[PDB]
């Protein structure tokens, strides 16, 4: 039941994204631009394939996956990872693994907003997205 996550979403709040990016070794200049960028995230399904686009003035990504099936991914910061996305407690949980490290990207719906929690190391970033009509 991924249905309430589908659609077009725009970033409206960000907490601790610089901490998260620093933890991943992202360079200062990229952090700097990223801290002023407001992406649009588009989540689409076709049968049990989901496609998740992240669009911005800086970087752009797109992944397609089946829930519960591992896929290769190259992240916006150029990490080559092994990924899996699953529903867990009604949350869309994306786990990335590379070099023995793990990142998680957890999405949930609260009061119609999509809350993305990004964790690497001890860093925890919370980004809030709201629907675009």
Ligand X SMILES: CCCCCCCCCCCCCCCC(=O)O
Residue 39 binds to ligand X (criterion: CB under 6 A): yes
Site string for ligand X, 83-102 (x = CB under 6 A): --------------------
56 binds ligand X (CB under 6 A): yes
Among 75, 119, 126, 128, binds ligand X (CB under 6 A): 75
| Per-position DSSP letters for 52-90, written without gaps between them | EEEE-SS--EEEEEETTS-EEEE-TT--EEEEEEEEETT
Distance CA(54)–CA(93), nearest Å, equals: 16
> Per CB under 6 A, does 128 bind ligand X?
no
Q: Which residues contact 49 (CB under 8 A, 6 or more apart)?
A: 64, 65, 66
Q: Which of 77, 91, 108, 115 binds ligand X (CB under 6 A)?
A: 77
One of 59, 93, 126, 128 touching ligand X (CB under 6 A):
59
Determine the Cα–Cα distance for residues 99 and 12; give it in Å rounded to an integer.
33
Q: Which of 2-10, 35-43, 65-73, 86-94 is the region at the interface with ligand X (rule: CB under 6 A)?
A: 35-43
Based on the shown chain and the rule CB under 6 A, indicate whether residue 22 belongs to the binding site for ligand X: no
Q: Which of 127, 102, 132, 130 is nearest to 117 (CA)?
A: 127
**Three-state SS at 21:** helix
**Is residue 37 near ligand X by the rule CB under 6 A?**
yes
Residues that bind ligand X (CB under 6 A): 11, 21, 26, 30, 34, 37, 39, 41, 54, 56, 58-59, 75-77, 116, 127
């Amino acid at each position: 039941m991924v249905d309430a996550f589908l659609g077009t979403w725009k970033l409206v709040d960000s907490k601790n994204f610089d901490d998260f990016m620093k933890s991943l070794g992202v360079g200062f200049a990229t952090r700097q631009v990223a801290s002023m960028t407001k992406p649009t995230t588009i989540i689409e399904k076709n049968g049990d394939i989901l496609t998740l686009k992240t669009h911005s003035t800086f970087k752009n990504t797109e992944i397609s996956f089946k829930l519960g099936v591992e896929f290769d991914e190259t992240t916006a910061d150029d990490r080559k990872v092994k990924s899996i996305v699953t529903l867990d407690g009604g949350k869309l949980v994306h786990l990335q693994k590379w070099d023995g490290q793990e990142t998680t990207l957890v999405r949930e719906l609260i009061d119609g907003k999509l809350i993305l929690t990004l964790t690497h190391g001890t860093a925890v970033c919370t980004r809030t997205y709201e629907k675009e009509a």
